[PDB]
């Protein structure tokens, strides 16, 4: 594929920095032709043959390709793609209403009806992707952005696909990526991956939505990963004293070591806790 | 343990930024009491209970503890430790002569006698650590700094211990850390770890010193890790056409999937290729 070999500065005005990914730098920008505001994602390119400062070209295309197919209200849109020697610049949809992580702390804990209002939107977005055999692999509060934060039940779009793959496979797909807190045991153990890893993440997100705490985080990175592979977590009455058995079951049907016994996305939408 | 709960700015002047680690920010600084120049490493602290922006407190102490014991000419020294709400600030020795990665590209390839001049110093530093049962876990050209770059056979000190552990164990130690290119298969497969992982890294460094290329890097992260677990590499005549069998053997006795059959640090110093 080929992106626009042009100066992004010619068509978009840069300013206010937003996210700060590993090799990704996000900046709030302004389209000159219309005045519309967009979000520009700078992806540094893997330099001279053998290096690690930057993302590989082949890995950048993968992300673009996925954003191209993608088309769903609860999911980000890619408008333009630029490129130069050093960086590829994805012009993306701007979601100004802040991350879900930010939103949580200020409420600190949601009611089950509120929690399911957020969850339904995720499950819709994740359902759409899984239909097209796309695994996000990085579902977490930081990649769940609200359109408007100051409305009663805020509406969300999913962001960041630098790690998403198409599981278009009678193949084998393994590797280690994502944030330790949210990764499924197969990623931790370096075992075959599928769409099932995202269902583990949602289980973790849901735990965080209800309790506020992360089910698997420990005092060290080592320990966080031990807990995940072991599946060492419990519904600590502290938070789950007044949580329904259905809500518990939903989470308990998603945090299952064996990816096959783990719930799928269509089963999650048919659950009594989520279903109307 | 307890660090200096004081403003680092009161005792050291900041300026020129050097490295840019994940949660670590390195800055070149100047001691006020003497005028001596030091390197200040800012470590962001893991914030409200459940988070990932920053290193855990327990993980920061571990690094400090290791730098405290540490005492060897080819190894960095920790002078002071400060702390505030957000960051812990390690005042470290300043190594101005740039990274080994930087040095390589401008040469771009070393002679075996030169290569062993660098290697001996590493093996000495790594030997000292392994004696005290300390595994660096992050041996790579970016963590190997030269004192003076413009001298014939430059002298090096090892840096960055945010990932180093003491393998003081009738215990189990597993987790995933380091740069994909240099990590040993047991880290990739999430299997028990020991001092042996560092011997894999040196094998990789040595390959890079002689050839310039990284033995296991592929076009994607997935592929890089496949090659490591598989141990898929060959002495490509392109680079190794004129490389000695001893140099080959040394590398070949270090890139062994099974950590036990892999060479130990004392065996590496007794090798004909390294030994006087």
Numbering used by the authors:
A (entry chain B), B (entry chain A): 2 to 277
What did the study's authors say about this model?
Members of the DAPK family are generally involved in both apoptotic and autophagy pathways and share significant overall sequence similarity with myosin light chain-related kinases and triple functional domain protein-related kinases (Temmerman et al., 2013). DAPK1 and DAPK2 bind Ca2+/CaM through a closely related ARD, which is inhibited by phosphorylation of an identical ARD residue Ser308 in both kinases (Shani et al., 2001, Shohat et al., 2001). We found an identical type of dimer arrangement in all three kinases that involves the BL of the CD.
Since hDAPK3 has no ARD, the hDAPK3 construct we used was limited to the CD. All three kinases were crystallized and the resulting structures were refined to a resolution of 2.0 Å (hDAPK1), 1.47 Å (hDAPK2), and 3.1 Å (hDAPK3). The root-mean-square deviation (RMSD) values of superimposed dimers from the different hDAPKs are in the range of 1.2–2.0 Å, demonstrating that the type of dimerization observed in the structures of hDAPK1, hDAPK2, and hDAPK3 is conserved. In the DAPK3 structure, in which the BL residue 50 is a serine instead of an arginine, the most specific interactions are formed by Arg53 and residues C-terminal to the BL from helix αC: Ser57 and Glu60. In DAPK3 there is an additional specific interaction with Glu182, which is the central residue of the PEF/Y motif and a key contributor to DAPK substrate recognition (Temmerman et al., 2014).
